[PDB]
Enzyme design. Structure first.
Site, PDB file in Angstrom:
ATOM      1  N   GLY A  14       0.841  -1.230  -0.008  1.00 28.65           N
ATOM      2  CA  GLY A  14       0.061  -0.002   0.052  1.00 28.65           C
ATOM      3  C   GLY A  14       0.978   1.292   0.085  1.00 28.65           C
ATOM      4  N   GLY A  16       0.782   5.690   0.995  1.00 25.37           N
ATOM      5  CA  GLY A  16       0.189   6.597   1.835  1.00 25.37           C
ATOM      6  C   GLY A  16       0.546   8.149   1.503  1.00 25.37           C
ATOM      7  N   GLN A  17       0.086   8.982   1.814  1.00 28.18           N
ATOM      8  CA  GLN A  17       0.502  10.418   1.773  1.00 28.18           C
ATOM      9  C   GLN A  17       1.888  10.795   2.166  1.00 28.18           C
ATOM     10  CG  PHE A  18       2.838  11.668   5.692  1.00 28.32           C
ATOM     11  CD1 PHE A  18       2.799  13.058   5.098  1.00 28.32           C
ATOM     12  CD2 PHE A  18       1.506  11.768   6.262  1.00 28.32           C
ATOM     13  CE1 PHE A  18       1.995  14.154   5.173  1.00 28.32           C
ATOM     14  CE2 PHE A  18       0.588  12.550   6.456  1.00 28.32           C
ATOM     15  CZ  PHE A  18       0.911  13.937   5.853  1.00 28.32           C
ATOM     16  N   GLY A  19       4.219   8.057   3.248  1.00 29.82           N
ATOM     17  CA  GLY A  19       4.850   6.510   3.261  1.00 29.82           C
ATOM     18  C   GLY A  19       4.386   5.575   2.262  1.00 29.82           C
ATOM     19  CD  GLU A  20       6.027   3.883  -2.361  1.00 28.18           C
ATOM     20  OE1 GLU A  20       6.327   2.846  -2.583  1.00 28.18           O
ATOM     21  OE2 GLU A  20       5.820   4.740  -3.362  1.00 28.18           O
ATOM     22  CB  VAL A  21       2.947  -0.574   3.559  1.00 23.62           C
ATOM     23  CG1 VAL A  21       3.181  -1.973   4.390  1.00 23.62           C
ATOM     24  CG2 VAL A  21       2.461   0.499   4.547  1.00 23.62           C
ATOM     25  CE  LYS A  39       4.079   3.618   9.346  1.00 22.98           C
ATOM     26  NZ  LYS A  39       2.614   3.684   9.857  1.00 22.98           N
ATOM     27  CG  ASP A 139      -9.782   1.949  16.423  1.00 22.50           C
ATOM     28  OD1 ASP A 139     -10.953   1.606  16.521  1.00 22.50           O
ATOM     29  OD2 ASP A 139      -9.126   2.059  15.562  1.00 22.50           O
ATOM     30  NE  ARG A 143     -11.835   0.224  12.566  1.00 28.58           N
ATOM     31  CZ  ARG A 143     -12.950  -0.012  13.553  1.00 28.58           C
ATOM     32  NH1 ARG A 143     -13.889  -0.597  13.212  1.00 28.58           N
ATOM     33  NH2 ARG A 143     -12.972   0.826  14.525  1.00 28.58           N
ATOM     34  CG  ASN A 144      -7.719  -1.404  14.334  1.00 25.65           C
ATOM     35  OD1 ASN A 144      -6.927  -0.972  13.098  1.00 25.65           O
ATOM     36  ND2 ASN A 144      -8.296  -0.310  14.777  1.00 25.65           N
ATOM     37  CG  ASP A 157      -4.548   1.306  16.714  1.00 24.25           C
ATOM     38  OD1 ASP A 157      -5.369   1.382  15.843  1.00 24.25           O
ATOM     39  OD2 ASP A 157      -4.664   1.750  17.702  1.00 24.25           O
TER      40      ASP A 157
END
Ligand SMILES: C[C@@H]1CN(c2cncnc2)Cc2cc(C(=O)Nc3cc(CN4CCN(C)CC4)cc(C(F)(F)F)c3)ccc21
Length: 285
Positions: A14, A16-21, A39, A139, A143-144, A157
């Site tokens: 995946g 993200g706006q600030f990183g990659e997985v 990450k 949380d 999903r988590n 999380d």
């Protein structure tokens, strides 16, 4: 610091706006190859994203249990910033259970009733570990929860990083975005998050497991009605409402779910009790 030269890229998981997985292989993991989730922070990521990243590393570094996501290593003495965890091949538990049907001999992969209990007991075990460390998850939901090989469950999380579950979070007064349908009544009204309210959320998570993640908790009720319901738990005038018994859930197991939803924090069963019930008592009607 983990030798990043030991991480072999395989596939992007995946963005993200600030990183990659990334999904990575590590040859000879004892220091065939071990698969890991990495990450990586983009070299142009904000100082705020860098702050969240380092604090996330600090938090995770203390959690070492078989039913909790493990931080294997970190690369932080140099850029780009990396954090390395276990790779849970089957994705989250919501995505996992949604893809299965219940094994019901009286009637696409299948999942048996004892297997749903083993999954829930592993979540209970993980939470007992967090509770004994005085760590409040805040949380807990399917999903988590992450699914690996051999039906291994690891509580994680992701926060709000994945846009997949925006319907499960509600923006209250102050721009705070909370998972109200999983939250205890004292959480929504006072912001009082404790091990006891993690039990309430486990109760809602057990409902999701038993529903095979087919419905949203209180799905027929609006966000405003889920909040108004917590005020009814506060007034204690017998007008508060509970999640309905999943079709495949026996009355005995449903009674355990209701206890997790006791008005009083101290009346909610500890995770050690939920764990033993889910692993030993499945002989109920
Ligand atoms: C890259 C990698 C991708 N991945 C993955 C695993 N298999 C398959 N495909 C992807 C699992 C994973 C999980 C976490 C994670 O789980 N991290 C975490 C962070 C907090 C703190 N905290 C920080 C701020 N935020 C708002 C809320 C959470 C608390 C806890 C818990 F649950 F263990 F306590 C856990 C972080 C990175 C990754």
């Amino acid at each position: 610091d983990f030798p990043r030269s030991r991480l072999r890229f395989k596939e992007k998981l995946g963005e993200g706006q600030f990183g990659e997985v990334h999904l990575c292989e590590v040859d000879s993991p004892q220091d065939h190859p071990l698969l890991v989730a990495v990450k990586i922070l983009r070299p142009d990521a904000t100082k705020n994203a860098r702050n969240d990243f380092l604090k996330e590393v600090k938090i995770m570094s203390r959690l070492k249990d078989p039913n909790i996501i493990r931080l294997l290593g970190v690369c932080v003495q140099d850029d780009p910033l990396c954090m390395i965890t276990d790779y849970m091949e089957n994705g989250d538990l919501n995505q996992f259970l949604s893809a299965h049907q219940l094994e019901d001999k009286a009637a696409g992969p299948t999942i048996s009733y004892p297997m749903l209990l083993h999954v829930a007991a592993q979540i209970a075990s993980g939470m007992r570990y967090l509770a004994t460390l005085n760590f409040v998850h805040r949380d807990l939901a399917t999903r988590n929860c992450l699914v690996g090989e051999n039906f291994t469950i690891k509580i994680a999380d992701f926060g709000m990083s994945r846009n997949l579950y925006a319907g499960d979070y509600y923006r209250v007064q102050g721009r705070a975005v909370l998972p109200i349908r999983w939250m205890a009544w004292e959480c929504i009204l006072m912001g009082k998050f404790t091990t006891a309210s993690d039990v309430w959320a486990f109760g809602v998570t057990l409902w999701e497991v038993l529903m095979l993640c087919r419905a949203q908790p209180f799905g027929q009720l609006t966000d405003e009605q889920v909040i108004e319901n917590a005020g009814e738990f506060f007034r204690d005038q017998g007008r508060q409402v509970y999640l309905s018994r999943p079709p495949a859930c026996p009355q005995g197991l449903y009674e355990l779910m209701l206890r997790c939803w006791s008005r009083e924090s101290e009346q909610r069963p500890p995770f050690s009790q939920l764990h033993r019930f889910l692993a030993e008592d499945a002989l109920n009607t």
